Symmetry: C5
Subunit: 334 residues, 5 copies
């Protein structure tokens, strides 16, 4: 109630305070318990091999230099006072661009407790790198991790743990990814040894499964229908050479245009993927259909009966071979 | 009139002032009344699932430490003095990137009143996230919200309300969205409970209806005309096999090119939409027209009368089936 | 000549100076005269509905607290001293992103005069929003404004005027817009009333006329030539069904490809424009040509004379109808 | 050797130093000699009409307030001391975005000399605007300038010169532009008069010649080959109406696709260029070939001899007319 | 254990400390040993001719002014104390945009040792320029270097060396480039002479070999198959003029579309590359096939036997010539 007394207490707490020294400097390591409240996952980029994540990152520790008596209340201070206190050098190992929101003020919270306990909250949007294995794209399953580490202090000076256990990270169920579904999330705590010593490490891992309905409707069905249209030329009478030539070469042209526009629309992934293999298979099928028609046209004059036999064998074989190819493709990747 | 007296009064106000402590610290919560004057909505991005908004955000509260007597005037101070005063830790829950304009100076206003009242104005451009359900795109209706919350202080330390009631937010009628029309806007005040306690919450919601004229003129009419051109082959005499083959396969090629270029131009939305369903329906219709012509050509030699009957039945059926499909599509999504 | 005396004078000027108080605080409003020297207009974006502008913005006012005697010279001070003086809270009403150049130093100039006059110059690159009516695009004429306002001070505390009258803004004739020509520029001074009072307002308006030669050469001529090629099928003998079918459907395909690629290249404007109407007209013309050929082919067997009559009527009508359409289009939009 | 003595000397130099006053304030202007060591030219953008340049910019001047005695050595100080010294208000007239590199520290160098001489070095990446005349693109030759000026000080307070004469700017020969070759570079020194007085001006001009091999291989050869393929129809027998119709209309389609994709790939330049004229000429040639074939087909029945004469005249004329067009094009632009 | 004693020792160390003076100022140069722990290589851009690299950059030196006694421990201080100490002016010669990560705090580490030794660690993401010779693209091998230099201090004031020898740079084996494989990395130490004297220089060079499987599957195979389809017309009977004309011109159209879409997808490299040469060769082959068919069609009437001989010679020659072209191409670039 008396703001002058509270100001005197805070000034006494900050009088002689050395921000350059960690709590219990030269003694036992200071334990920092961390919790994450995930607000959203903005995007998951395959081209950049990363994902954007917005979260409330809260750190919990104890500094006996900040213990105060006579006030039976928790002191929620202005965020600017965080510039006058020691804070852990927590950073994200795999991030590429991170920032703290600063509207209207810096998205930062400092709460002090009578026993010297400090709660330090930040709102962070971080773009964390995620190496994605896109061999099975778009039927792939990815695993993206956020790594939390101390930068300068070793395990002799600081220790990390998930405050609250498996419930340390919340808001995962509220994540709305249009293209992915979060199968599972895991929390890991360990120590990692580098040339400068052992450092604490926390890990938050998500497992994402990609949705396939959009790719099925927009990437596979046109190719299947173009392959069927390529088959259509088999039932066309072989006397109409111009009609069958036009049909085959125009199916080839449609397949080429579809492949090029899909490659333009699909993420710029410079290695072989499942959808690329399927498109190549469809292109090879239409190419073989055109070659078969060419052979039939060439051998028609010498022996029309053999040409008709080849035509009917193509009618009975091409759908069967394509069905076998599709069965192999959809059993290998599923 | 006497600037020395005003300077003395301001120095006395700021002498002993503790920015780390909220007004009435340890007592009743400080009530903050907020008003928004929307200048513009820059863009609404479906790919990024967000919208950019520029506004004048004004906060109104009372700090008895700033009460001054002897000056029967309101003191409009330089914005820099805002760095020497306590301000609410107001932030936007769903924003992704926000900034305060700083040309020529920081777009900030501090006005003091004799009773200790503080008016604090900012000009903020914020990119607020908006989860959009694009199943009915481009006939969709969206609801985008701006959430305002206190970051560190709970409801025991601060309370939010819309100053002016339903007239707290102005400038909505002046918003000029080229692709959307603002059907309605709503103001909500409530409290939200998290693990750290209850926090005040204000919500400003807009309901947007997308315009359809551009999509009708540029996305549906070409598909309808290509479907009609596919129908055209039915009246063409079946003796000209090459002509009908070329017409059908070229209609298929035009449909594929139109679909690919629309997908390139349309926002990168990785799930099924209404326009995708319409394009797939048109593609299926032209595919079925080509298949019907192939069947007629195959059965023409064995029984020309049956081929002619199938041709005339196609003439009478394909427009009817397409009309039924269009009626179902335009009654389901409207 | 004596730098020690000048330093003493400047220190005396800045001794007891209160930056939180405007000149003549509590008295008459301080008049600020503004001049703009436009260096360039970087770009004019229709998609973003804005324009980038680089300028030298100079403010002129009087502060009696800075009046000095004994030095018969104007004091051009280091720009950093601007952080120790009161400056107007001038901002741009319609800007979206503005910055002051800072290489090698902050592009800022402070000049003091013996009578207390202050000249304050900045080099500002501002992206000002401009709502563009693109119904007549690319034959449109736009009007883009830059609005200058005081943020916190009302008309009782500050007044704005164009220093130099109509010659306040210079460098307009030197602006080199590749796609636009500046027809006129205007200067407006007024007062605008908001809920917090009346504020001064300056307005600098440009009228831009878009160049049409690029669009005429690259957007209209291909469509006209494709329409003529569609007409070409009328003179082709109707016995060659395959040739006319191929010509018509390939003209349709070329028109579709041209329209799609123009839409990709043209700015992403989500409403109807003049060029879209012209492209739709050309597409409708080629569609009607193909339909007419189909009708002629259908009725050729029953009555060849009527088919020939329809063919010659098409020959005499289609160019005439297209000429009427072009005349209406080029008289409506010009 | 004695760091305490050096620290005492530096403190004495900075004791009573007024950064707000230029050297020899109120007397003769301070002469600043400038040298540039160009590290690279990152890019030259026609769409943005600018070029990115990284350089070491060194300024040389004399400040008698910094003269020190007793130390027969040059004092290379930490860059942070530059914040405690007067520096020229040097800026780039035509730049759009410039910054000083700040990793690991700010890329800044301060060197003091016993006679008060100051050497001040910065590493600056500046995007300087360059108005490019693209009428002769891609056979164009451009001239891009970097302008250096004092912002606040006139010629009565500061003077600029190129330290070292024509050898002031180095590293030009090491510039590796993939698309341009630096024909020449020039240094200019002058004074420019504005409403606020006369200001010193330095200018560094580069003359760039664009390479043509990529455009010759990828932009002209396909058009020439498509024109030859259009000519091919002349030797095809006129009895095959379908074959010649298909060849002509497909050459037109290929030309349209090539033009559209080149326009997409080429920089977004909204006015007529040489390559656009060449593409239009090729398109007109194929259009005229198709029209000639149509006329031959129309007049074939009435008088086959005249049709054959027109066909052979086309065979002998079209290559000749195209050769004349190419000769005019390659003599006008070379 | 006693934090007050440690604070007293640190204050004594920083009392009288001059950050403007290097260690051993006026004496022997200070030796700085540098180590790099590469975390990742984000991207390698051919269009921008650069590569993004994230690393832990650690500098090791000795400052006798920071030597402390009585504490038999290494002092890991808060990163902010780095603003109160002298640090080397280390910068990257070829970088374009670099930054130090600042979440949650600035990614910076200061460790002091009793003998005055300072370890200074930063986490830096730098976009270093790399001039790439893309004549053999996509079969090219590149060499990208990171150059480390002192900005202001010469070799008389500072010396650089790789601390740990060839093991100074770690984490190279963990680099996961989707499109490149790191063949080798090298460390170089030398001195470079400029007009201002001799400066130390460290160099970290990577040799990258581009993967070819994606280009083989997606860029060469379609062209080869289209060339084979162009050959297909040779076996087609020459009586069907329309069929062969359509096949040849549609193969030309497919080749043009493939080339244009590859150019759109491929990096914007404005000079000749190997893949461009291969595409031009395939286009020339299909063009020659169409020309040969045209010649056969022209000479068929006068002498069918010669036309058949030319057709069979084309059948036996075109695959052979294409095989020779492919052998030359794949032996020249491999
Ligand atoms: C995405 O991919 C990452 C890997 O790249 C996965 O991360 C791994 O997750 C597993 C758990 O699913 C981790 O395994 C566990 O590690 C714990 C930590 O081990 C360290 O610390 C202990 C001391 O506390 C040391 O002894 C040890 O050497 C390590 O230094 C262990 O404590 C766990 O052991 C417990 O469970 C196992 C069974 O799982 C029992 O057998 C044990 O007795 C004990 O009860 C366990 O081994 C693994 O370390 C993680 N790897 C990395 C690199 O972080 C993500 O899980 C994955 N994403 C998803 C969604 O799965
Ligand atoms: C976009 O979508 C959002 C939701 O995602 C919509 O937001 C909802 O808007 C409605 C109003 O249209 C809100 O409903 C109202 O909430 C008020 C607040 O309730 C809180 O506080 C009270 C105490 O003050 C608590 O008791 C309560 O549990 C909550 O914690 C209520 O006060 C309102 O009740 C009043 O009106 C109703 C009728 O509407 C009466 O029955 C009541 O008696 C009373 O008079 C009301 O319930 C809702 O809370 C909002 N949801 C969220 C999540 O914010 C947007 O409206 C939508 N956009 C548009 C344009 O509609
Ligand atoms: C782009 O579009 C904008 C509008 O969106 C145009 O801006 C308008 O420009 C016109 C001038 O061309 C302005 O009209 C003038 O306004 C002056 C200011 O009026 C205010 O202040 C006075 C007191 O000084 C008040 O009485 C008044 O109510 C306003 O608050 C007037 O002083 C002018 O009047 C003078 O000229 C008129 C004739 O034009 C005479 O009849 C009068 O007697 C008097 O001599 C005049 O009315 C208009 O205000 C501007 N509008 C806005 C919103 O700024 C741009 O011009 C346009 N771009 C281009 C290139 O034209
Ligand atoms: C890209 O384009 C720019 C222009 O947009 C070119 O810049 C011009 O470069 C020429 C030189 O090639 C400049 O001409 C020279 O200007 C000097 C400066 O003149 C100013 O200062 C003097 C006093 O010192 C005043 O008298 C004068 O009025 C100016 O204010 C002159 O000193 C030069 O004169 C000398 O050479 C000429 C012959 O060239 C002799 O006749 C004279 O007697 C004397 O010896 C000369 O006139 C020109 O000023 C530049 N223009 C601008 C706007 O900067 C770039 O050169 C071009 N890029 C390339 C690569 O060429
Ligand atoms: C990418 O491309 C760059 C060049 O652009 C390559 O960098 C070169 O790497 C080679 C090593 O592979 C360097 O050659 C070595 O330079 C050392 C430094 O020389 C300087 O300093 C010495 C004094 O210490 C001076 O005498 C000398 O004049 C230089 O100023 C030498 O010490 C090395 O010599 C040793 O090895 C050679 C054999 O290699 C022996 O003959 C010598 O006796 C001695 O033992 C050696 O010459 C070269 O300097 C680098 N060039 C540049 C510009 O940095 C990268 O290697 C390449 N990338 C990859 C992966 O290879
Ligand atoms: C509030 O605390 C101050 C500082 O200790 C003290 O001087 C003052 O008397 C207190 N107020 C009351 C009402 O006791
Ligand atoms: C310059 O001014 C200072 C301060 O007033 C004074 O002490 C000094 O004597 C003056 N110099 C001369 C030459 O008068
Ligand atoms: C170094 O300079 C300081 C300051 O002048 C002085 O006190 C000290 O004695 C000098 N050192 C020596 C060895 O003379
Ligand atoms: C810790 O160091 C301080 C400062 O030297 C000293 O006053 C204090 O007595 C020390 N503590 C102990 C337990 O000796
Ligand atoms: N122009 C004063 C600030 C403002 C405008 N609208 C609302 N607030
Ligand atoms: Cl932000
Ligand atoms: Cl801004
Ligand atoms: Cl800048
Ligand atoms: Cl940088
Ligand atoms: Cl970062």
């Amino acid at each position: 109630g008396n703001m002058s007394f509270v100001k005197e207490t805070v000034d006494k707490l900050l009088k002689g305070y050395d921000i350059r020294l960690r709590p219990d400097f030269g003694g036992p390591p200071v334990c920092v318990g961390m919790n994450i409240d995930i607000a959203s996952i903005d995007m998951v980029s395959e081209v950049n091999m990363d994902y954007t994540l917005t979260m409330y990152f809260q750190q919990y520790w104890r500094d006996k230099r900040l213990a105060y008596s006579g006030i039976p209340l928790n002191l929620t201070l202005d965020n600017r006072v965080a510039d006058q206190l020691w804070v852990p050098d927590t950073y994200f190992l795999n991030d590429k661009k991170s920032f703290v929101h600063g509207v209207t003020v810096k998205n930062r919270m400092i709460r002090l407790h009578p026993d010297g306990t400090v709660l330090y909250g930040l709102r962070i949007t971080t773009t964390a790198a995620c190496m994605m294995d896109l061999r099975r794209y778009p039927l792939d399953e990815q695993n993206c991790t956020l790594e939390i580490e101390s930068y300068g202090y070793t395990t002799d000076d600081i220790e990390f743990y998930w405050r609250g256990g498996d419930k340390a990270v919340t808001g995962v169920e509220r994540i709305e990814l249009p293209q992915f579904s979060i199968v599972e999330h895991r929390l890991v705590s360990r120590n990692v040894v580098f040339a400068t010593g052992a450092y604490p490490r926390l890990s938050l891992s998500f497992r994402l499964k990609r949705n396939i309905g959009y790719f099925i409707l927009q990437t596979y069905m046109p190719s299947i229908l173009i392959t069927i249209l390529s088959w259509v030329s088999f039932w066309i009478n072989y006397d109409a050479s111009a009609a069958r030539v036009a049909l085959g070469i125009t199916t080839v042209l449609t397949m080429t245009t579809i492949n090029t526009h899909l490659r333009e629309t699909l993420p710029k992934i410079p290695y072989v993927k499942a959808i690329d293999m399927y498109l190549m298979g469809c292109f090879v099928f239409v190419f073989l259909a055109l070659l078969e028609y060419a052979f039939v046209n060439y051998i028609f004059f010498s022996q029309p009966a053999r040409a008709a036999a080849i035509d009917r064998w193509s009618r009975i074989v091409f759908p069967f071979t394509f069905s076998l190819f599709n069965l192999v493709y959809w059993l290998y990747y599923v």
